[PDB]
Structures are given as structure tokens and as C-alpha cells.
Amino acid sequence: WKLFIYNPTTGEFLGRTAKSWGLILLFYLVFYGFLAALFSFTMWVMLQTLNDEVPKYRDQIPSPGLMVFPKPVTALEYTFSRSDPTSYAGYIEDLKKFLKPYTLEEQKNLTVCPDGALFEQKGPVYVACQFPISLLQACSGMNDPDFGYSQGNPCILVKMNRIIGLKPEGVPRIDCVSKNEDIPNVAVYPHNGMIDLKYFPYYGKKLHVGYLQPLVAVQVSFAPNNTGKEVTVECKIDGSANLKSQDDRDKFLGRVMFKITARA
Amino acid sequence: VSMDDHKLSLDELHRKYGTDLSRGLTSARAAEILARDGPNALTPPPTTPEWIKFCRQLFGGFSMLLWIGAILCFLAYSIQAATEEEPQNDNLYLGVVLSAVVIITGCFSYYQEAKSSKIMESFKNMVPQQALVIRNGEKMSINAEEVVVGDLVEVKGGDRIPADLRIISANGCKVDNSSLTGESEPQTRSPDFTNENPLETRNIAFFSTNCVEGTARGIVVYTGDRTVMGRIATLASGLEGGQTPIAAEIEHFIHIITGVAVFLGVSFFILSLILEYTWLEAVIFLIGIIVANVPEGLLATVTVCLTLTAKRMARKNCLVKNLEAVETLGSTSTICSDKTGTLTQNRMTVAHMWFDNQIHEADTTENQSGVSFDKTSATWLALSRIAGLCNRAVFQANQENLPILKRAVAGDASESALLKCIELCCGSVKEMRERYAKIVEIPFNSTNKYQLSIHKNPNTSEPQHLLVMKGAPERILDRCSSILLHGKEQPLDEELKDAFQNAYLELGGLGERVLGFCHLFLPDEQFPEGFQFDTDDVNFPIDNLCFVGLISMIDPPRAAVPDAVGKCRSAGIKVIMVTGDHPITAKAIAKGVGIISEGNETVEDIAARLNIPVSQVNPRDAKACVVHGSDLKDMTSEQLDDILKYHTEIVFARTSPQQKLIIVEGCQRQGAIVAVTGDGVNDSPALKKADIGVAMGIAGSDVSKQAADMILLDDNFASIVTGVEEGRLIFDNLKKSIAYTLTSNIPEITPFLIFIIANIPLPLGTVTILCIDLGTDMVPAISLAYEQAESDIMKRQPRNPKTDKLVNERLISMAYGQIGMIQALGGFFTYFVILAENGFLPIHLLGLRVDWDDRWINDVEDSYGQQWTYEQRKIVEFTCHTAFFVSIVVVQWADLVICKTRRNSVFQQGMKNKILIFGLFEETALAAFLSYCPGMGVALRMYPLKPTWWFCAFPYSLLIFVYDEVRKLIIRRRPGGWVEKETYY
Amino acid sequence: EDDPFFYDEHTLRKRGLLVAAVLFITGIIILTSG
Ligand SMILES: CCCCCCCC/C=C\CCCCCCCC(=O)OC[C@H](COP(=O)(O)OCC[N+](C)(C)C)OC(=O)CCCCCCC/C=C/CCCCCCCC
Ligand SMILES: CCCCCCCCCCCCCCCCCC(=O)OC[C@H](COP(=O)([O-])OCC[N+](C)(C)C)OC(=O)CCCCCCCCCCCCCCCCC
Ligand SMILES: CCCCCCCCCCCCCCCCCC(=O)OC[C@H](COP(=O)([O-])OCC[N+](C)(C)C)OC(=O)CCCCCCCCCCCCCCCCC
Ligand SMILES: Nc1ncnc2c1ncn2[C@@H]1O[C@H](COP(=O)(O)OP(=O)(O)CP(=O)(O)O)[C@@H](O)[C@H]1O
Ligand SMILES: CC(C)CCC[C@@H](C)[C@H]1CC[C@H]2[C@@H]3CC=C4C[C@@H](O)CC[C@]4(C)[C@H]3CC[C@]12C
Ligand SMILES: CC(C)CCC[C@@H](C)[C@H]1CC[C@H]2[C@@H]3CC=C4C[C@@H](O)CC[C@]4(C)[C@H]3CC[C@]12C
Ligand SMILES: CC(C)CCC[C@@H](C)[C@H]1CC[C@H]2[C@@H]3CC=C4C[C@@H](O)CC[C@]4(C)[C@H]3CC[C@]12C
Ligand SMILES: [Mg+2]
Ligand code: NA
Ligand code: NA
Ligand code: NA
């Protein structure tokens, strides 16, 4: 409109700036302060009813998911060149950072546990069983600095999602099969794809201090004959009925699909 | 087509049609002609087919925008189906729901409009046009449909022409030819042939035209659709034109809100495309936001309000031409009403008398004996002679076997009472009038305020001319130099002048209409027996008459007028009394009906009490005034405002028909919506100039009925109180409905803004956005149109159309700043509760947006160390969306309850609106069905709520209810304070 | 023995549908009340 902001006359900025504007701003400030106080108090009362050790509901996450590591730049597509040190540098750095707690130097505090038996903890100490990185052969830092890259044999860590109080029945096992007519050789360095029961159950970040989740490493052996070829690797949980893997709604429920492309 | 009787003489007129120029055709002949020809009614043309109106409802308003929404949903689903195998069906169900909503809204609006139109059309025929035909010599009132070819009608001022008339005898007849000529200037009708073209000659009536002044008599030549108006394709009445102020407010609000909604939709669409939204998702979000912000249920609310008003007008016998105009009646702040026919029963009888310098009393009805004074008095004989000779009214046909007090009449009320009294205490007026031949008469009009008649003298004295006059007592007395006392004529001196003044004070203070009578014996030498008198020429000496006496007639006020006027004054409406009668009678009637309340006094009254001159009294000491018509003539525009401003109770007297229009302009100049209640022809311009015009349905003239916007068929003055109440109710219901729809907008747009800013997972999606808009803002907002009137609807002052609009800053401030924010807070609290109960504490949610929405990151970690896949956390997010929708229904329950009233509590206005309870129950049932029905997790991504998640929004709903109740309590306890200045919308 | 990762969805949906139907019927009844 025209003017309506002029300093003269009782009307300034569509009203009275000295009195009307001040009073309405004060009323809005008080109203919104009371609203914010009520919102904060209501959330505080809600948070008083929660437990910091275990979530109130776990029915929305009944089965674990399989996720690969490190996460590629675009949609689980590992694209790298053996001739370019910078193509796979990010993967090497991320793997080194992730596997730092798994080194023998770091996890000396953790205790060794008997294999093959589910290790339940009722005691409040909640010790964490140690996972020796040596189980991942040729996919650890000790064998070579780069985790199989620059040689045509990249390492991909297949980690299983953590769920509090999950007790996988039977013997869990992650099997990986290459969909590229099985031309390359897919190797899982832990025997078969075995995941030991001594790590489960998970008791949460608060209680179960220093947990080291089981890891599975897969090397896609790219032959020197074929270069510039893309291979799809399908991994899923097999040996345990408690862990669901045949689900169509979710493509990552006990299952993962990733593609590796080597260049030069 | 030019073949008429305009150029034919009277000799061949009788032969061609077989009807006497004076007597006319007989009743049997008229019945035979009607049976041969048919009725005098135009064939009603079918305007539009019924489902053409249905399509207009379907594609009218925001329904078209919802149509584009549905088409876009279907197109997006088609693209998804063509592209990706087994796509999501959310778009398909969304388009289906949108189309169903559009169809249901359209059919509901069509049904309500059909009901309203049926009520109006059926109730419009309740006022039949009446024609004053002449049959078998006598004249009688007959329905205008029965008019045939051949009969002759007696049309006077204020009556529309029944059909094409070949005028043979006119007395100053002028008609309004605005339909053909295109001007409002009256055209004089005279029997003489003037122009070869019938359209230009002035001896023919063209049907559907209004006779402004004078009366004429003519034979019907063309009837039905054969008339001149029938030939032209354009209809005579046509359609009403003009945009109602409430309609203008609706249009402006719709434009503003649509612009705001489109801007918000486009901004959100661009922001979504920035934040890695797919094109189809962005388009669906665009249409969802745009549909959410617009109030597409507003038009149905307006139609429902109009239909309810039509219901309530029909029961009160109020005929409203345009249902939107009732809101103007509710907004009325001043009512201008005339005395005779509106504030009074218009059934007057002769009550008091004054001649021979003494006040006589006469029995109004059922005397059943000789009159108290002697009928042998020469003065009484002269007065009766003048009353009989000057009267124009004649008795109806075949009513000679019933008492005179029950005999029907054809003239005005005053002439009717004079005729009844003369018949009662005199001889037979028919033979008395036949004894004294009529030569020339000037019909009564408000400009001259008198009626003149010339009669021959067959007595022993033979002046051969009798100049009898009747009119306003004061005006004629100024034209008289002699007065007849006890049969003897003496010059009029000051003693008899002030004796007449005190006598009229005695008569005028009883609320009685009074007329004056005079006669003059014209000399033989001045005018011989073979003399022609012209109405345009003065000829005979109009002045220098001989005064005789006064007739005082009791005219009681209508029964419902006092209470209705009291209610109007208690509603903040200033009722102004404007009339052409004497100030004394006008003031008496004003005090009787309550215009001038007791205790209030005029300047003249104050001066009389204080014995000081009127000029000494300060005008401001009197809050009531009686402005004479003579003073208003020389009164300037500025001075008119002072009286209409300083005085609370104003009475106008002796006002000409144009002075009523002047007063209407003066009242409107002060920014006031005026209502004029006029029934006679003299109120034609005021009725058209007023914001709302009211005409009486029985005694009102045809021109006044045409010019008025509202017609009272029952002649009940309480109908005006009902009309203003229903206009106020329309405004209140519309304002309540608009406020409810606006609050939901903040809960629908806030989640996306917080999503962008705080980078938390999305609290509300498109499907739940549209579920809030359709589920909570259609049936509940419409039901707010069924809300009954508050207790204090008629106790509040009329709304000022300048400062108070349908949507203002206080309504927007309320609905957006306070209620909308509380609703958004409730939704966000339920969001945080669900996300925390599943493992994602509120602090952990900040910054999860990139990782949460990443389809390939399937190890999103919550606060407890668990890792979630993409689908697993998406189920939780969609449960949060469903509970956000549910939480908005719970808070909206409180908003519907608080909207129910504007100042009163819900305790004072009980839950007697069954439509509103139905809306609450249906929206709640819809929310429960959407949450808990199997297959909704695939159809629309809605998942069941755990039982305790329904109560997360309860404290905010209670907060809304309590805050609004205490705010309304502050409004009532402290009126005019800061809270009312800012919150009261 | 209470088991995590499991919720009585079928009972919840059945009770919710019953309440939705009851509210629907009551809304119809209150609408056509006389
Ligand atoms: C437009 C509407 C927007 C609504 C949403 C607002 C934005 C929300 C976005 C981010 C807020 C995230 C949460 C903030 C608090 C995080 C830190 C926290 O976790 O806090 C803890 C405290 C006390 O908890 P504890 O340690 O005892 O629990 C421990 C229980 N164990 C141990 C079992 C877990 O919890 C508390 O105090 C509660 C603190 C809540 C602070 C809310 C501040 C924002 C509110 C805004 C509303 C304003 C309304 C008017 C708007 C006007 C706009 C013009
Ligand atoms: C990051 C991207 C942006 C964030 C997300 C999207 C946010 C945008 C939210 C919607 C904005 C809509 C603002 C409407 C304001 C009111 C206007 C209106 O129609 O008023 C009616 C009225 C018309 O009323 P009227 O004409 O009937 O009354 C005139 C007054 N009398 C009675 C005297 C005649 O507007 C006016 O002319 C008067 C009120 C002032 C209007 C201006 C208000 C401030 C506008 C601020 C706009 C900010 C936009 C920010 C965009 C950011 C983009 C990066
Ligand atoms: C990042 C922040 C994002 C914030 C987004 C906020 C979303 C706001 C949504 C729109 C709210 C306003 C709706 C207006 C509807 C008006 C309807 C109507 O008919 O009005 C006629 C009426 C006419 O009323 P009236 O005639 O009584 O007005 C005359 C005024 N007096 C009497 C004082 C002379 O107009 C209004 O009511 C206008 C209300 C004022 C609107 C104020 C808007 C303020 C700006 C809001 C935030 C915008 C973004 C700012 C930050 C940008 C950062 C880059
Ligand atoms: N038929 C008639 N013949 C002669 N004089 C008449 C008359 N009818 C009314 N009068 C006088 O002329 C005046 C008519 O003025 P006007 O027509 O403006 O007001 P009114 O008499 O119609 C009262 P209202 O305004 O309520 O209809 C009245 O005061 C009355 O005294
Ligand atoms: C505003 C003042 C006067 C009263 C405050 C009432 C508050 C404290 C009450 C009313 C409604 C209640 C909430 C209702 C629903 C739930 C969800 C449930 O899973 C945990 C408890 C929780 C989160 C409640 C917390 C406490 C609560 C918010
Ligand atoms: C949470 C963030 C992202 C959005 C917040 C929107 C808020 C700040 C906006 C949206 C609508 C706005 C209100 C719209 C109307 C009015 C009326 C005016 O006379 C005073 C300001 C007031 C009350 C505005 C205050 C600011 C407001 C409440
Ligand atoms: C119509 C309005 C005024 C009142 C409606 C109250 C409704 C919305 C609320 C109040 C209490 C709620 C119920 C509380 C407990 C249960 C049991 C659970 O196994 C199914 C959900 C169900 C049945 C809830 C459904 C919704 C509910 C019925
Ligand atoms: Mg009149
Ligand atoms: Na809305
Ligand atoms: Na809407
Ligand atoms: Na709303």
C-alpha cells in the first residue's frame, strides 16, 4: 500500500509503534515463552519415563540388517583404479579408522571368551568379548597397509546390525556369491561365514562398554585377465532361523548387495 | 409491428371491442373472453438445465484446483507405473480421494443451492400482482392474471401497468419507461394522438412500466406474451444486478488466501527440489501444500448459511430478493421508517371533530345511534358535503348487504375513513355525489399536499361552481380568508387562528391524523355555466377559500412496532421517523411507538417548561428533535449532519418525497448503513438509494415492491428485527468458520520448515498433510455454519464495515500465532514421544536428516547403540506422520469447541449443534480407521498407533480450550480493554 | 514369558477398528437424533 509507515500521525508501521507495537510484541513474547516452557516441561516429563539403558520398544527392529563397509560414494558402488592411489585412498582411510578399535593393541582390556556358546550377562559389570583382527586374513592392516587394493583384491567389511537383546538361534553365517556368472572368486576369510555366538547378545551402548561386533571380510579376486569389469556380490544370513533374510519390502534385512568395479 | 388504436378515435374503440368506455364489459363476458384467450402471464423461459448448474458447482471455486490436484496425482501414478515395476499406489489413492471429495462437495453444494432456489421461487409467488379492472360499471380489485383483451383498468400512481393500455382518459398520468426508452424521467400520458409511431406516441402503455404520478383509465389491447415487452427477447424483469458487500469480502479474502497458498506451495516445491526430492514427490508435495492452505470448504459454508437464512425468512413471511443482502440488514445501523402503513396499522377511522369553534366527539365504530351533535347544523352539512365531494374512493362491487364498517374500499386510508364516517352519519354518498356533478379534480399528491374538486350547485343558490378542497390543515388555512361559523361566514381573525392552533394541539397530541376542509362559492360572472377548467391553468381562484372545520382520525400504531423498535434501539440501531404528516402527530406517534423515549424532551418542550423562548434554549440540551419539512428545504448539507449527529431520537415531519431521499443521503454520509421502510409511491427514490430497502407486502405499492430488496408479506415490523438478527448470525457463522480453517495451516507447513532448519527427520508427509486438510477442515468447518445465534447477538452494537471486516489482522493473529502454534507444538510433541520411545532421543535427531533419508545407509544408529536399516526407521517415521495427523484431530476438537462462540462460553451456548458433534465423531472415526485398518501400511504408509500415543496431544487441546475460555471471560468482564482491542476478531 | 521384538498388532488393530466403528455409528446416531 501507499505510505502506512509514516512517522507522523498516531499510525506508524500499520499501528502505534510506541504503545501498540510494544504491547503486542510483549504479549507474543510472553505467550511464546509460556508455550516453550510448557513444551520443555512436557518433554522432560516424557523423558523421565524412559530408560537410558534399553529402548522402550524394540518391535520395530526385530531382525538385523546387513551393511557393508566402507560406504562408497554412490549407492554401494565400489569404483577404484589400481594405478591411481587416490581412487581408493578414501576406502583405505575409512577402513583404518574403523578397524582401529579391533587392533590387538587397543582391545587388550577386553576378555577372551569360549567359542560356540551364547554368552549371556546378568551381572552389572557387562564385560565385552574381544574380537581378534587376525580372523580377517589379508583384510587387516598387518598383512599390508592397503586392504587388498592396488592388487586387484579389494576387501569389503560386511557388518551385521546391532540389536539390543538379540539371541540368534543356531549358527549364524554370512554367505557371499558373485552374480557375475561366478567368474571372479569371492573369498570370506572367517571360516565359511561363521559369526560366533559369544558376541551376542548386545546389551546397549550404555551398559555393554567396549562392544566389538562380529565382522565379515570379503575379497573379490579380480583376475589380471579381466579389467574394467563390474561384479555384483550378494550376501545374506543363512544358518540362523531367528535372523530373517527372505523379505521383499526391505532389501537389506539380513541381506546386502554391492558392486565392485576395478579399473586398469 | 405498428398496428394499434393510438390514432383511432373513441367512436370505433367501443365497436371494435364491445366494451363501454365507462361501464366496461360485464363479468360473464369477461369470463367468456378469459376462457377463450387465456391468462395474462408471460411464459417463463427455462434459463439453464439442472445439471448445468451441477457442473458449475463441480468446477466452481477451489474445486477446480482440487481437480488439477487429482489429475496430477493420477499422472504421477501413471508415470511411476510406466517407469518402475510395482510402484507405490499412494498417488492413486490420493487422486481417488481428491476426486471423491470434489464430487461430494459439489453435490452437497448443488443440493443446498437447489433447496434455497426452490424456497425462494416458491415463496416469491406468494405476492401476486393485482389489477384494478372495471366491470359492470363498478370497479373491483382482480388478479392481474385474469386481465384479458377488452377490459379497462384503473391504474394510479405507484401501480405497474398490467398490460398494453390504449389510454382514453388520464388525469396527469406519467409513467416510467426505463425499460424501452432507457431513462427514469416520467413521460406524460394523455389520450390525444401525438406521434405516428406507437413507441413515441403518448396515448399507449407498454406493459411492465410504473405509473409515477396521476391515474389513468384505458382498454387492454394486448395481453400475455403478445405485448410489446413480450416481443423483445430481453425479459422485462430481467435479473437482479450488483455485488453484495459480504460477497466482495469473500472474494477479496479468497484472492488473498489463494495467493498466499500458491506462494507457499511454490516455495516449498523449490525447497524440496533443493533437498534432493524427486520431481514426482516435489509435485505431489506442491499440490498437497496448496490444497492444505486454501479453504476449499468455504463456499459450501456460505451456501449452507444462505439456505438456513432462506429457511428462517420463509417462516417469518419475509420475501428476500437476494439472500446475500440479509448481511447488509444485519450490518444496518440506522432505520428510516415512515409513519403511515409501517409504524401504524393503516386502518384509521374518524374519531374527533372541530368546527364552529368547539371540539366534537364522534364514535369511531359501532355507534348504533344518532350522532351526538345535531346533523341539522349548516356547518356540519357543509363539512359532510366537502368530505363526500372531494373523496375519490368508491365502494367495492356487490357489498351492499354487509355493515359499512366492514365494506371494502378502493381509495386511500384517509379517504376510506372519510367515506365510512359520511356513510355512517349522513345519507348515501353515491346519490349525494350523483347530485353534485364532477367537472374537474386534481388528484392528491405529496408535493401539493391537497386535493381539489369542482362541483355544480343545484340548491336554491346557484353559483354553478363549488370549489371544495381537502388537504393538510395548516397549508389550506394559509389560503383562506373566511370561515363559516354556525352556517354564517366571517373573515378569519387572529382569535380563530389561535383557537384552531390550540384545538389542533388537543387533537394532534392524541396520535390522530387530521385533515382540513374548505369550500368556495365561485361567482357566476367570473365563470359562466359553459366554462372549461384546465388542470394546468389556474383559472378558478385556488386561494381565498372559506374554511369549515377539521376531521380528526384515530390511527393506532401496529401491535408489534413498540417491541420491535425497542429491540432495534437495544441492538444499537438508531430508528429515524420520517413522514409527511404534522410535527405534532408525528411526535405523538413517535412517543407512542417508542421512537422518542420517556424523559427525553425537545428544545421546544424545554423552552415551554422553562417559560423562556425557544431561541434561548441551548440546542444540545435536547437529545430528541422534530425537524419540520419547511426548515429542511432551506437547510444546508453541513447543518444536516449536526442534527443526525448530536440528536439520538430524530423525527422528520412534513417531508416531501425528495426530502426523504435527502435525509437518506445525509444519514449515509456519516458512514452508516441505512434501512428505509417505505410502502407508498412517494418512497421510490429512498428505497433505491438505501443500502437495504424494505417494502410492505399488502399495502405497499408495486413500484415500492420492485425497488425494495426485502418485502414483508405479513406486514410485521418484528420481521425487521428478525432480518437484522439473521444478518448478524450469517456474519458470525462465517467468521467462526473462517477462523477454524485458518489454524490448521501452521501445523501443515511448520514440519517442513523445522525439517529444513533443524535437519530432523520429516514429522509430516504429503498424505498426512492432505488427511489433516480433508478430514479435519471440511465437515467440521461446514458444521460451524449451523451454529445457533449467541445470547447477546442482538445486544451488541452494529458492526462498522470499515474497521470490522470478515477477515482482519486479529483473526489472522489469533488463528496463526496462537491456536496454530499450539496445534503445531502438540504434533511435534507426539513426534518426539514416538521417536524417543523407539530409541531415537530428541538430541540425537538433530542432523540425522541426511543419514535418515539415505536409501543406501542401512546402519543408522540410535541413542541406545542399535543400528537401523532404511525401511526399519522409515516405518517409525511414517508412524510419526500418522500420529502427527492424529494429534492434530485431538487439538482441532478443542478448536471447533472454541470457535462455536465469539464472546460467550461453550457452557452458556450448549452443544445443541448436532452437526458439529457429528463432525467431531466422524473425523475421530476417520483418524482411527486410517491408523488401524489393515493394508493402510501399504496403501498410504499409515501404521497403527499404540494406545498411549493418543493422549500425547491432550494437554495442548486442554490448553487451547482453557486459554480461549479465560480470554472470552476477560472479554466479557472487561469490555473495550486491551484484550478486546487485539484478540476479539 | 514376555518377548521383545514382538507386539500384539492384531489385537491392537481389532480394538482400533471396533472403536472406529463405534464412533462412526454414534456419529450417525447423534446426527439423526430425534
Ligand atoms: C514451531 C514448533 C517447533 C517445535 C519443535 C522445536 C524444535 C525442536 C528441535 C530440536 C530440539 C531437540 C531437543 C532439545 C533438547 C535436547 C537435549 C535434551 O535431551 O534435553 C534434556 C532435558 C532434560 O531431560 P533429562 O536429562 O532429565 O532426561 C534424561 C532421561 N534419560 C536419561 C532416560 C534419557 O529435556 C528438556 O529439558 C526438554 C528440552 C526441550 C527444548 C525445546 C526447545 C524448542 C521448543 C520450541 C517451542 C517454541 C514454541 C513457540 C515457537 C515460536 C516460534 C516463533
Ligand atoms: C527459505 C524460503 C522461504 C521460507 C519458507 C516460506 C516462507 C513464506 C511464508 C509465506 C509468506 C506470506 C506472507 C503474507 C503476508 C501478508 C500479505 C497479505 O496478503 O496481507 C493482506 C493485506 C491486505 O489487506 P487489505 O488491503 O484488506 O487492508 C489494507 C488496510 N486497510 C484496511 C487500511 C485498507 O496486506 C497488506 O497490504 C497489509 C498488511 C501488510 C502486508 C505485508 C506483511 C509482511 C510481508 C512479509 C513477507 C515475507 C516473505 C518471505 C519470503 C522468503 C523467501 C526467501
Ligand atoms: C524461516 C521462517 C519461515 C516463516 C514462515 C511463516 C509462514 C506464515 C504463513 C502465512 C501467514 C499469514 C497469512 C495471511 C492471510 C491474510 C488473509 C486476509 O484476507 O488478510 C486480510 C487482512 C486485512 O486486515 P485489516 O484490514 O484488519 O488490516 C488493516 C490493519 N490495521 C487495522 C492495523 C490498519 O490482512 C491481514 O490480516 C494481514 C495479517 C498480517 C500478516 C503478517 C505476516 C508476517 C510475516 C510472516 C512470516 C513471513 C516470512 C518472514 C521471514 C522471511 C525470512 C527471509
Ligand atoms: N387523500 C388525501 N387528500 C388530501 N390530503 C391528504 C390526503 N392524504 C394525505 N393528505 C395530507 O397530505 C399529507 C401527505 O403527506 P405525505 O404523503 O408526505 O405523508 P403521509 O400522509 O403519506 C404519512 P407517511 O409518510 O407515513 O406515508 C398528510 O399530512 C395529510 O394531512
Ligand atoms: C500442563 C499441566 C497443567 C499438566 C501436564 C500434564 C502432563 C505432565 C501429562 C499429560 C499427558 C501426559 C502424556 C500422555 C502420553 C504419554 C505417552 C506415554 O508413552 C508416556 C507418557 C506420556 C508422554 C505422558 C507424559 C505426561 C503427560 C504429558
Ligand atoms: C518455526 C518457524 C520456522 C516458523 C514460525 C512462523 C511465525 C514466526 C510466523 C508465522 C505467522 C506469523 C504471524 C502472522 C500474523 C501476525 C499478526 C500481526 O499483527 C502480528 C504478527 C503475527 C502474529 C505474525 C507473527 C509471526 C508468525 C507467527
Ligand atoms: C470422539 C472423541 C470426542 C473421543 C474419542 C476418544 C478416542 C479418540 C481415544 C480415547 C482413548 C483411545 C483408546 C485408548 C485405548 C485403546 C485400546 C487399544 O487396544 C486400541 C486403541 C484404543 C481403543 C484407543 C483408541 C482411541 C481412543 C478411543
Ligand atoms: Mg408512504
Ligand atoms: Na487450512
Ligand atoms: Na482445506
Ligand atoms: Na482448522
Within 10 angstroms of residue B632's Cβ, the number of other Cβ atoms is 20
CB-CB contact of B96 with B86 (8 Å)? no
| Length of chain C in terms of residues written | 34
The cell for B424 is: 355512517
Report the DSSP beta bridge partners of residue B861. B867
Report the distance separating Cα A65 and Cα B938, nearest Å: 21
In whole angstroms, give the CA distance from residue B432 to residue B459.
Answer: 13
Q: Which residues of A touch C (CB under 8 A)?
A: 57-59, 61-63, 163, 165-166
Please report, to the nearest 10 degrees, the dihedral formed by the alpha carbons of residues B379, B352, B515, B384 taken in order. -30
- The CATH superfamily holding the domain B315-343+557-724 is HAD superfamily/HAD-like (3.40.50.1000)
Contact A110, A210 (CB under 8 A): yes
Q: Decide: B873 and B784 in contact? Cβ < 8 Å.
A: no
Q: Coil, strand, or helix at residue B613?
A: coil
Distance between CA atoms of residues B678 and B699, nearest Å: 10
From A34, A44, A45, the mutation candidate for ligand 5 (largest count of ligand atoms within 8 A of CB) is A45
Query: What is the distance in A from the centroid of ligand 2 to the CA of B978?
Result: 24
SS (H, E, C) chain A: CCCCCCCCCCCCCCCCHHHHHHHHHHHHHHHHHHHHHHHHHHHHHHHHCCCCCCCCCCCCCCCCEEEEECCCCCCCEEEEECCCCCCCHHHHHHHHHHCCCCCCCCCCCCECCCCCCCCCCCCCCCCCECCCHHHCCCCCCCCCCCCCCCCCCCEEEEEECCCECCCCCCCCEEEEEECCCCCCEEEECCCCCECCCCCCCECHHHHCCCCCCCEEEEEEECCCCCCCCEEEEEEEECCCCCCCCCCCCCCCECEEEEEEEEEC
3-state secondary structure string, B129-151? CEEEEECCCCEEEEEHHHCCCCC
* DSSP bridge partners of B7: none
CB B608 within 8 A of CB B626: no
Distance (Å, rounded) from C-alpha B297 to C-alpha B779? 8
Closest CA to B40 of B172, B146, B188, B183: B146
Q: Please answer whether residues B952 and B829 qualify as being in contact, where contact means their C-beta atoms are separated by less than 8 angstroms.
A: yes
Dihedral sign of CA atoms B846, B850, B851, B854 in order: positive
3-state secondary structure of B282: helix
HSE, side-chain direction, 13 A CA sphere, residue B29? 14
User: What residue has cell string 447488509?
Assistant: B328
User: Is ligand 4 within 6 A of the CB of residue B446?
Assistant: yes
Interface probe, candidates C13, C25, C32, chain B, greatest B C-beta count within 10 A: C13
Residue A174 in contact with residue A238, Cβ under 8 Å?
yes
Q: Number of residue pairs across A and C with CB atoms under 8 Å?
A: 14
Rounded Cα distance, B806 and B793, in Å: 16
Q: Which atom of ligand 1 is nearest to the CA of B824?
A: 2
Q: Which residues of C touch B917 (CB under 8 A)?
A: 27, 30-31
Q: How far apart are CA B410 and CA B392, in angstroms?
A: 9
Instruction: Identify all chain A residues contacting C4, using CB atoms and an 8 Å cutoff.
Output: 58-59, 165
Query: Dihedral angle at the C-alpha atoms of B23, B27, B31, B34, nearest 10 degrees?
Result: 30
Ligand 1 centroid from CA B832, angstroms:
9
Nearest to B759 by CA among B860, B843, B672, B825: B843
The answer to whether B542 touches B480, Cβ cutoff 8 Å, is no
3-state secondary structure of B956: helix
Q: Please state the atom number of ligand 1 nearest to the C-alpha of residue B845.
A: 12
Rounded distance between C-alpha atoms, residue B262 and residue B257, angstroms: 9
Q: Is CATH 3.20.20.140 the right assignment for the domain spanning B349-554?
A: no
Name residues whose C-beta falls within 8 Å of residue A143's C-beta, 6 or more positions apart in sequence: A137
- Strand partners for B188: B174
Whole-Å CA distances, A22 to A16, A25, A28, B810 = 8, 5, 10, 16
Cβ contact A232:A197 at 8 Å: no
What helix, strand, coil percent values describe chain B, rounded to 5? Answer: 50, 15, 35
According to DSSP, the residues that pair with B409 across neighbouring strands are B395
The H or E element that residue B187 is part of is: strand B187-189
- B964 in a known ligand binding site: no
Cβ neighbors of B398 (< 8 A, separation 6 or more) are B138
**Contact call for residues A82 and A262 (beta carbons, < 8 A):** yes
CA of B654 to the centre of ligand 4 (A): 9
Please report which helix (H) or strand (E) contains residue B693, including its range.
strand B692-696
Q: For residue B813, which atom of ligand 3 is closest to its CA?
A: 39
B contacts of C9 (beta carbons < 8 Å)? 944
Sign of CA dihedral B946, B950, B956, B959: negative
The best mutation among B451, B515, B553, B717 to test binding of ligand 4, ranked by most ligand atoms within 8 Å of the C-beta, falls on: B515
Q: How is residue A230 written as a grid cell?
A: 563390474
- In three-state secondary structure terms, B211 is strand
Cβ count within 10 A of residue A178? 18
CA atoms within 13 A on the CB side of B475: 19
- Quick count: other Cβ atoms within 10 Å of Cβ B440? 15
- In sequence order, the 6+-apart residues with CB closer than 8 A to the CB of C24 are B921, B922, B925, B929
Neighbours of chain A (3+ CB pairs under 8 A): B, C
Q: Which three cell numbers stand for residue B39?
A: 391468462
**Residue A50 to chain C, least CA–CA distance (Å):** 16
Q: How far is C5 from chain A (nearest CA, A)?
A: 4
B60 neighbors B113 (Cβ within 8 angstroms): no
B679 annotated as belonging to a binding site for a ligand? yes
Domain ranges for chain A: 1-49, 58-264
Q: Are B511 and B555 in contact (CB under 8 A)?
A: yes
> Which has the closest alpha carbon to B187: B215, B152, B213?
B213
Chain B touching partners, 3 or more CB pairs below 8 A = A, C
Please tell me which of the candidates C15, C20, C33 has its beta carbon nearest to residue B914.
C33
Closest residue to atom 7 of ligand 6, CA basis? B817
B412 labelled ligand-binding: no
Phi and psi at B564, nearest 5°, equal -65, -40
Q: Which residues contact B513 (CB under 8 A, 6 or more apart)?
A: B340, B348, B414, B552, B553, B555, B581, B585
- The dotted CATH code for A58-264 is 2.60.40.1660
The nearest CA of chain B is from the CA of C11 a distance in Å of: 10
Neighbours of chain C (3+ CB pairs under 8 A): A, B
How many angstroms separate the CA atoms of B374 and B381, rounded?
A: 10
Distance of CA B643 to the CA centre of its chain: 27
Query: What is the residue type of A19?
Result: K
| Radius of gyration of chain A from its Cα atoms, rounded to whole angstroms | 28
Over its C-alpha atoms, chain B yields an Rg (Å, rounded) of 37
Q: Which contacts of B932-940 are long-range, i.e. CB under 8 A and separated by 24 or more positions?
A: B932/C12, B932/C13, B932/C15, B932/C16, B932/C17, B932/C20, B933/C13, B933/C17, B933/C20, B934/C13, B937/B875, B937/B878, B938/B89, B939/B89, B939/B90, B939/B93, B940/B90, B940/B93, B940/B94, B940/B767
d(CA B713, CA B700): 10
CB of B164 closer than 8 Å to CB of B186: no
Quote the cell numbers at residue B919.
463432525
Q: After which residues is chain C broken (C to N over 2.5 A)?
A: none
Chain B contact set for A46 (CB, 8 A): 829, 832-833, 836
| Residue B66, C-alpha cell as written in the block | 482440487
Give the contacts of B75 (CB within 8 A, at least 6 positions apart). Answer: none
A54, B838 contact by CB (below 8 A): no
What topology is assigned to B744-985 in CATH?
Calcium-transporting ATPase, transmembrane domain (1.20.1110)
Q: Residue ranges per domain, chain B?
A: 250-294, 315-343+557-724, 349-554, 744-985
Residue B462 phi/psi, 5° resolution? -130, 70
Q: What are phi and psi of B553, to 5 degrees?
A: -120, 130
Nearest one of B336, B969, B966 to B686, comparing CA atoms: B336
Contact by Cβ (8 Å): B391, B468: no
Q: Specify the DSSP class assigned to residue B621.
A: G
**How far is B577 from B556, CA to CA, in rounded Å?**
16
Contacts of A159 in chain B (CB under 8 A): 859
What single letter denotes the amino acid at residue A15?
A: G
Q: Are strands B334-337 and B574-578 parallel, antiparallel or unpaired?
A: parallel
| Amino acid (1-letter code) at residue A254 | G
